[PDB]
Amino acid sequence: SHMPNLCVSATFNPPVITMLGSALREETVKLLEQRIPTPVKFLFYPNPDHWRMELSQHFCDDLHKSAVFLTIIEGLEGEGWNLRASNSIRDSESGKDTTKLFFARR
Amino acid sequence: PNLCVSATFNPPVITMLGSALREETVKLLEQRIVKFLFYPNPDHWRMELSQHFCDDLHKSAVFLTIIEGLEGEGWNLRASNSIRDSESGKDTTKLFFARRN
Amino acid sequence: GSHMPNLCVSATFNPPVITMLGSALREETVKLLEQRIPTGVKFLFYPNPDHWRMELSQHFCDDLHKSAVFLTIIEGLEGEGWNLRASNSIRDSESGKDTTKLFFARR
Amino acid sequence: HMPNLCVSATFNPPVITMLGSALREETVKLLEQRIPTGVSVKFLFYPNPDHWRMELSQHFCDDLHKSAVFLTIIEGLEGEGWNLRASNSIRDSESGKDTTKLFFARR
Ligand SMILES: [Cl-]
Ligand SMILES: [Cl-]
Ligand SMILES: [Cl-]
Ligand SMILES: [Mg+2]
Ligand SMILES: [Mg+2]
Ligand code: NA
Questions:
Q1: GO molecular function, one example (chain A) (predicted)?
Q2: CA torsion, ordered A100, A102, D19, D53, to nearest 10 deg
């Protein structure tokens, strides 16, 4: 170990954001839960340990999805997490798209 | 500061989000890639090429011009992703940039 | 082999099938990942193209566990001197399977 | 002013296109030799936009061979001074074709 990474995954719609990473501190999660709506919360779950936020009453179009990704990337960069890679898929039957963002420590 | 550029085809619709994006950078891209129009909430620049059709090769050329234009302005490419929507027949690609500072 | 070797790790779901390509991938790295991935079974070697393959036949990874699998692979490989450079993913509507690729370069 | 390169690969049959004004023909020839070796043909030049295109009409690549093609391209380019920065991919359900893009920078 000693090489911590972070994965943020975002599925739409409705928006469901998950954050995974062994060195991810709750204080980082709390900073992002204030940025993303700009009083919805991230809930913690184990195996694998992660934080999950669902915006049940929200619908994001392409522009607002771009804004969500940007706020996450900017918030995490300020916390010492650098963006290294991303990927995305769209599921034709559910009509949902999922995007993953991978970060490394500097 | 970071920047997200999103490009949907077809017709081409290019959106650029990032508070630190200069209007001078936007103008350089306009000449490289009709104009980008500014809109608030969220603050962004949007260019729509209604009378244009870009095939796979021209989509690659559009991405390259955007990346090269932004690199010269101090924005480094960090990641990308893409999806194709089977019902609309449209594909959307995102390009993420970070400042070299 | 002018300037530094590379790796490609591909993962298809479901069931999870992980493939690792790259001539410079040492068997010691493959063993470390074998211990890591279930925590988040062995890799078998096949030629033409040379690669390591692991199947988890009795497993069904939801989206969260897919993210955990990618993270364990990235972290394991980073500790071994392999830096993540890019990723991509597709979903096949007819098979219902998604495939994600992770590309690494030497430090 | 900074040169970048985009390599796009569509399957099946495999069609590889390379765009980037600063791409040397020596680099094109190197990849021309590497790509068939990864799966075991030439790249043709076309204008508007200027690019190199290779076909393998008599070939059908499974997911493993697609990974091998991407890896050979990345490794070949890295030796030529091109660093991998990003990738993306889509699958078209009606044509049954998948397209992957690989972006490289000289820096
Ligand atoms: Cl992607
Ligand atoms: Cl990427
Ligand atoms: Cl897709
Ligand atoms: Mg994709
Ligand atoms: Mg990507
Ligand atoms: Na990258």
A1: metal ion binding
A2: -60
